[PDB]
RNA sequence: AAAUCCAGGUACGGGUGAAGACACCCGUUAGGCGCAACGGGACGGAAAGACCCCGUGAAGCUUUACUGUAGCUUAAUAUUG
RNA sequence: UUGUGGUAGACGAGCGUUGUAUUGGAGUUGAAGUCAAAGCGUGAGCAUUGGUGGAUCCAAUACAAGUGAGAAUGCCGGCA
RNA sequence: GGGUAGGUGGUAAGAACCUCAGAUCCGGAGAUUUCCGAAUGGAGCAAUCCGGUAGUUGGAAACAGCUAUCAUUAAUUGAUGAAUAAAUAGUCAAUUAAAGCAAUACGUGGUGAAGUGAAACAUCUCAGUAGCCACAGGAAAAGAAAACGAAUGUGAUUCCGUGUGUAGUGGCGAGCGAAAGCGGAACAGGCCAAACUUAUCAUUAGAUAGGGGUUGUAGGGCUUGCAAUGUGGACUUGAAAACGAUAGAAGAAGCUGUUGGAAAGCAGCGCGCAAAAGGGUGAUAGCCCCGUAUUUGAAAUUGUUUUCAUACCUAGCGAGAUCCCUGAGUAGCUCGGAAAACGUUAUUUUGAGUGAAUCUGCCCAGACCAUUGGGUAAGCCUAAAUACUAAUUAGUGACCGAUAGCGAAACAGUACCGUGAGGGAAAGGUGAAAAGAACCCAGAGAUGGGAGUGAAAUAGAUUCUGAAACCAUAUGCCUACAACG
């Protein structure tokens, strides 16, 4: 509204209050901000639940999930018969891209998800574009021919690498399974069941 | 304008309530009083500032 | 009235403005009584009794 | 490419003129018509106008010309076949010249 | 061209009637249609009366009507020893 | 058997227009529109034929309304 | 690049050319871009006038061509420099940004009425609405507890439903109306100051540039050890891949007869379909044409996502010392206002005045005190869900169909009105195809009557259908002694 001259006022004081609040020294912190936030965890003393929270974070990251979707899946599995500690494991592992990553035609789970979303993926009684469909223990997932028309091929090799709960024949692009992954195939990255109780408190 | 030069704090507009609660818009003006300070080789330059800022300068040793 | 969404059946009956195919969770009262005729799958019928309860 | 070009023999399959064989002299793609010689003969009542060196005479009586016809009413005429018939055409691309060529679908005749 | 115009084929006297009738009742008079005139009537035309009243209508103006306020004046307080 | 004058008003039963959904049907051998006539109904209203017209329309059951013109010194257009 | 055999934009015929060494046309990227206009060399009555400077070409010079540059403000730097020694003010030069517009729409902030209701009216309502102004952005604002609030409680902000028209607030009148809790959409928490320490400033630093730190079941610093070399970001550069956007390619299937001017209608016999959406073709076409379903394709520009590497941030649990730091004209208080549902009041904010304390600390739990409990003010940044559509692409309508729908289907904000701001219309349809009536007669001609084209000319440019009011002609009946809704 005139010659405000921040030099005139800032130096006018050299400390003051307005001077120090604005103090151009104001850095960027433009890397400090991001990373620390990123994601944290640890366990504390007063609530115990700290363990549950950290474990929940790990599990969701292992499959790339948003907390809201997780609450939905827990609600689904919760009601049925009884001690369903065998059901929700199948539910969490029934993800189509999860099956695609354990099937072995992608270098990483999220990359497999990208593929799925880009329409690589052919099913049985149906087809698939959405990377969240719950598959049934005994289901087939015939891979497209167009993807093979783009030989990067490097994948087929991973396919054979596989994990026992997945039965897929390389090159020939086909997959199904039975005897759903036992806890051995769900390694100690997240192997606890009081995260279930954490969601029982938070989700009715 | 009728405003301080150190800060940007200006007038305060409000209501003039009287008996019978009659409403009339009024303006409170800040006490702009001239003041001289020593900055950049102590160069004194008269600056119209609010008495509040005048007290702040006096306590901050700036006003000398 | 179809329970498993067969693709070969859906590829046909799409150029026919007369006939149409729907899932059990998709048929309504009006689609049922506009039919004048319908072909129902056996497993669709088993799901029908289940839905009625 | 186009179904009808300038020069190929063509016939009419609808209207008062049935089985009218002719040669397309000019094609207007925008309004989708076609001038075919010998067909759609109209007779403008030629008046007399004299305002130019050529208009000083402009001898015009009952000149019979050509009226344009919609391309839908036109159909290609077969020539290679011993028994000529009217049919539809494809747009096969022969790798010999990598050029698109019209081929009939009730026979194997090019153009 | 113009304002006007519910449809009209549109007499007078007495009476009647929303209380002053071309149209109602009872009588009298009058062939159909123009043109030039003059204004008696059609409570003639033009202007949802300006007078009067009504509206818990509007606006202008006045004052020791009410409530406020610009301005003017006095004191405390800060700049202020 | 008792009834059926009627304003303000209350209640009940219906007609008509356009479109949508289901059924059926007519139409260049002539639909809608539009004019005329010596028809049918208790009422809104509904037909038959002929002329003109040149491409959509009808019947039934439901549904949704910009759904019914004689008046507002009403608006617009035309003509006295 | 695609794509062909036509093209030279519409009222538009003709003349003259271009085009198969690949035209016109479509898409991507560029070139040129007069003058006015933020207009910015100076002015000015907009699209005009008058220049300066540095080059270069003609002239013998004035001069005239051809180029580039010349506004103001703010920031940085350098030079010069007054009253008045120094030093500043000031002056000059260089570099970097700012100006303005629009999307009749959303955001924030400042300012801020009245008509009206209360059946009058002043408190109040209307309403923090209209308007005025400033600043943006693709969203903005808000935001990580000195919180809610009454409990073995929840644990940033935002938006939706309910709580409810509830508690309350109101000339307790008209009216106004939450905050908790619960159910959902999305979800993310970060960073400085101070301590302590390093280096440098006539080191009077009280200043500059680094390491250290970011808190509440208190945190950090001081000294002393163990465990760590990771996981993750709101992240930089690159490389690779995938999914698209901006032109396109291919894309099945019918004949006969009848009415008819014309078949696609109607009838007979067939055929195709991942195509029976639609448009045109002389009537109403799945199979006449263009297309549609489906399969495909990008030289160039651009969007999203993924993989790998690469900068830049990011890390646990102990011991002792009892020492230091934790945001002051600040929180409170007084006098006038306001924000919250509240008409001012515990909480929030401020115009004037005054004014604290430092974890045995401070604030809060609707006056206030004590106990209990909750939380860490006076510093900063923060994606997502949320608000809107002038515009681009696709599509839909128990939406309108020339008095309707935008004022504007046509060349409409035009004609026109007003000094100006401003106000503001009406008007669409020949025929399948102009085949738009050559020619004859009357007439000065327009025109009319024939002829001709056409299925139709009573479809003729006055051009789809053509209602009533209104004006004329005529068959038949009645009417000039007659008082007439
Ligand atoms: Mg008021
Ligand atoms: Mg007149
Ligand atoms: Mg009397
Ligand atoms: Mg009068
Ligand atoms: Mg009156
Ligand atoms: Mg009054
Ligand atoms: Mg009043
Ligand atoms: Mg005084
Ligand atoms: Mg009655
Ligand atoms: Mg109907
Ligand atoms: Mg008729
Ligand atoms: Mg109406
Ligand atoms: Mg080219
Ligand atoms: Mg008022
Ligand atoms: Mg009132
Ligand atoms: Mg009133
Ligand atoms: Mg923001
Ligand atoms: Mg594609
Ligand atoms: Mg094609
Ligand atoms: Mg085809
Ligand atoms: Mg068709
Ligand atoms: Mg307090
Ligand atoms: Mg308030
Ligand atoms: Mg404490
Ligand atoms: Mg603090
Ligand atoms: Mg209009
Ligand atoms: Mg009209
Ligand atoms: Mg004018
Ligand atoms: Mg004629
Ligand atoms: Mg006329
Ligand atoms: Mg007409
Ligand atoms: Mg007589
Ligand atoms: Mg007589
Ligand atoms: Mg009489």
UniProtKB/Swiss-Prot annotation, chain A:
Residues 94-155 form the S4 RNA-binding domain. The gene is rpsD. InterPro entries: Ribosomal_uS4 (IPR022801), Ribosomal_uS4_bac-type (IPR005709), Ribosomal_uS4_CS (IPR018079), Ribosomal_uS4_N (IPR001912), S4_RNA-bd (IPR002942), S4_RNA-bd_sf (IPR036986). PROSITE patterns: RIBOSOMAL_S4 (PS00632), S4 (PS50889). The keyword Cytoplasm does not apply. It comes from the Bacteria. Belongs to the universal ribosomal protein uS4 family. Part of the 30S ribosomal subunit. Contacts protein S5. The interaction surface between S4 and S5 is involved in control of translational fidelity. Pfam families: Ribosomal_S4 (PF00163), S4 (PF01479). GO terms for cellular component: small ribosomal subunit. One of the primary rRNA binding proteins, it binds directly to 16S rRNA where it nucleates assembly of the body of the 30S subunit. With S5 and S12 plays an important role in translational accuracy. GO terms for molecular function: rRNA binding; structural constituent of ribosome. HAMAP family: Ribosomal_uS4_B. This is Small ribosomal subunit protein uS4. It comes from Mycoplasma pneumoniae (strain ATCC 29342 / M129 / Subtype 1) (Mycoplasmoides pneumoniae). Keywords: Ribonucleoprotein, Ribosomal protein, RNA-binding, rRNA-binding. The keyword Metal-binding does not apply. GO terms for biological process: ribosomal small subunit biogenesis; translation.
Curated annotation (Swiss-Prot), chain B:
One of its GO terms (biological process) is translation. Belongs to the bacterial ribosomal protein bL28 family. It comes from the Bacteria. NCBIfam families: L28. GO terms for cellular component: ribonucleoprotein complex; ribosome. It holds the Pfam family Ribosomal_L28. The keyword Ribosomal protein applies. One of its GO terms (molecular function) is structural constituent of ribosome. Keywords: Ribonucleoprotein, Ribosomal protein. The keyword Ribosomal protein applies. The gene is rpmB. Residues 1-20 are annotated as: Disordered. This is Large ribosomal subunit protein bL28.
Curated annotation (Swiss-Prot), chain C:
It comes from the Bacteria. Part of the 50S ribosomal subunit. One of the primary rRNA binding proteins, this protein initially binds near the 5'-end of the 23S rRNA. It is important during the early stages of 50S assembly. It makes multiple contacts with different domains of the 23S rRNA in the assembled 50S subunit and ribosome. Belongs to the universal ribosomal protein uL4 family. This is Large ribosomal subunit protein uL4. The lineage of its organism: Bacteria, Bacillati, Mycoplasmatota, Mycoplasmoidales, Mycoplasmoidaceae. The chain holds residues 160 to 212 of 212 of the full protein.
UniProtKB/Swiss-Prot annotation, chain D:
It comes from the Bacteria. InterPro entries: KOW, Rib_uL2_dom2, Ribosomal_uL24, Ribosomal_uL24_CS, Ribosomal_uL24_KOW, Translation_prot_SH3-like_sf. SMART domains: KOW. GO terms for biological process: translation. CDD domains: KOW_RPL26 (cd06089). Disulfide bonds: none annotated. One of its GO terms (cellular component) is ribosome. GO terms for molecular function: rRNA binding; structural constituent of ribosome. Pfam families: KOW, ribosomal_L24. Residues 43-62 are annotated as: Disordered. Keywords: Ribonucleoprotein, Ribosomal protein, RNA-binding, rRNA-binding. One of two assembly initiator proteins, it binds directly to the 5'-end of the 23S rRNA, where it nucleates assembly of the 50S subunit. One of the proteins that surrounds the polypeptide exit tunnel on the outside of the subunit. Part of the 50S ribosomal subunit. Belongs to the universal ribosomal protein uL24 family. HAMAP family: Ribosomal_uL24_B (MF_01326_B). This is Large ribosomal subunit protein uL24. It comes from Mycoplasma pneumoniae (strain ATCC 29342 / M129 / Subtype 1).
